From a paper:
SALT is a one such glycine rich Man-binding lectin known to be induced in rice under the effect of salinity, elevated ionic concentration, sucrose starvation, and water deprivation. Along with SalT transcript expression induced under different stress conditions, its expression is also found to be regulated by developmental and hormonal clues. These reports emphasize on the key role of SALT protein in regulation of multiple processes including plant growth, development and stress responses. The present work delves with the detailed structural characterization of SALT protein in complex with mannose both in solution as well in crystalline state using SAXS data analysis and X-ray crystallography, respectively. Overall, our studies unequivocally prove that SALT exists as a tightly bound dimer.
From crystals grown at 18 °C, we could acquire diffraction data up to 1.66 Å. The crystals were monoclinic with P1211 space group with two molecules of SALT in each asymmetric unit. The structure of SALT protein is predominantly composed of β-sheets (66.2%) and remaining is random coil or unstructured loops interconnecting them. There are 3 β-sheets, each composed of 4 β-strands. Interestingly, two molecules of mannose are also present in the asymmetric unit, each bound to a protein chain. Each mannose is bound to the protein through 8 H-bonds involving protein residues Gly14, Gly133, Thr134, Leu135, and Asp137. In our structure of SALT protein, both the loops are closer to the main body of the protein and have significantly lower B-factor indicating a more stable conformation. This might be the result of the bound mannose or the two mutations i.e. G62S and H74Q, which are located in vicinity of the loops. Importantly, the computed SAXS profile of our crystal structure of SALT protein is in excellent agreement with the experimental SAXS profile with a χ2 value of 1.5 indicating the dimer structure seen in our crystal structure is present in solution as well.
Author numbering:
A (entry chain A), B (entry chain B): 1 to 145
Amino acid sequence: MTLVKIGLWGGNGGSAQDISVPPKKLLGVTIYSSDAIRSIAFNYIGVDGQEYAIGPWGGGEGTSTEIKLGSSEHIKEISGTHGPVYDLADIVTYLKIVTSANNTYEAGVPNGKEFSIPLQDSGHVVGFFGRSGTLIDAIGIYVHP
Amino acid sequence: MTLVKIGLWGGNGGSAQDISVPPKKLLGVTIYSSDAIRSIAFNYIGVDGQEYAIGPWGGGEGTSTEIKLGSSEHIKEISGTHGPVYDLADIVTYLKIVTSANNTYEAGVPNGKEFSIPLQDSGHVVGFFGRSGTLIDAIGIYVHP
Ligand SMILES: OC[C@H]1O[C@H](O)[C@@H](O)[C@@H](O)[C@@H]1O
Ligand SMILES: OC[C@H]1O[C@H](O)[C@@H](O)[C@@H](O)[C@@H]1O
């Protein structure tokens, strides 16, 4: 009914990004990265029962990390770093996502300040918000209890 | 499950600590600290309507930090560091708590890996879990959406 909204982690560059329909079920996340997180996109079923394909936020290019999820496989842990890269002061530089199936996905290069959200009980990540320009300046999460 | 349970951050020393009645409303937090977090205690109204006085977890001593909260003032941001201190490898070394009234409370000395939970919308911290022995080895939070 009410999602928990946590973040964002990263700098103040770029423009605010968000979703207008709260997610109910996260189906996929696609990240592009080099030495920093270059884009994020994600696909979910809204609380309205409709499917949304969000993004990409950021300029992309680099190498892809494609995370596919569903009714039983949930994101249970997300962490990363944010800091200086490519002559910018504070960018999301690295992301690590762990699902309930013990599938681990990593993007970028650890560099800067840590953040981490390990979820217990039934909590899981269902969506994102943040800031983007050419890169992902900052990232935040929506958490389904 | 109505609360979001996040964490813990810190090492694997000490013994697991937790609460059994889910919190509805957090009324106060008491922290003792030196170069590390030496104890935490808190009191809350449970979902059963009863008041609970939890802790102290940890051995305490040092300087006290007393955080008082209520129906309008609650914890919107909690952050900290964990890592080596004294002759130990991974302890909660520092905590910063910010309330909806823009009251900020700090305990310990920043040292080690960062963690941070900045809550948006209606989310707020209502309780804690973690690990303790002589000190607070690790700390986690319960979040009310
Ligand atoms: O996204 C990284 C960077 O991209 C562009 O240079 C601009 O949008 C900046 O404001 C932003 O910080
Ligand atoms: O709490 C810090 C330290 O205190 C005690 O001596 C023991 O419980 C340890 O296992 C613990 O790591």
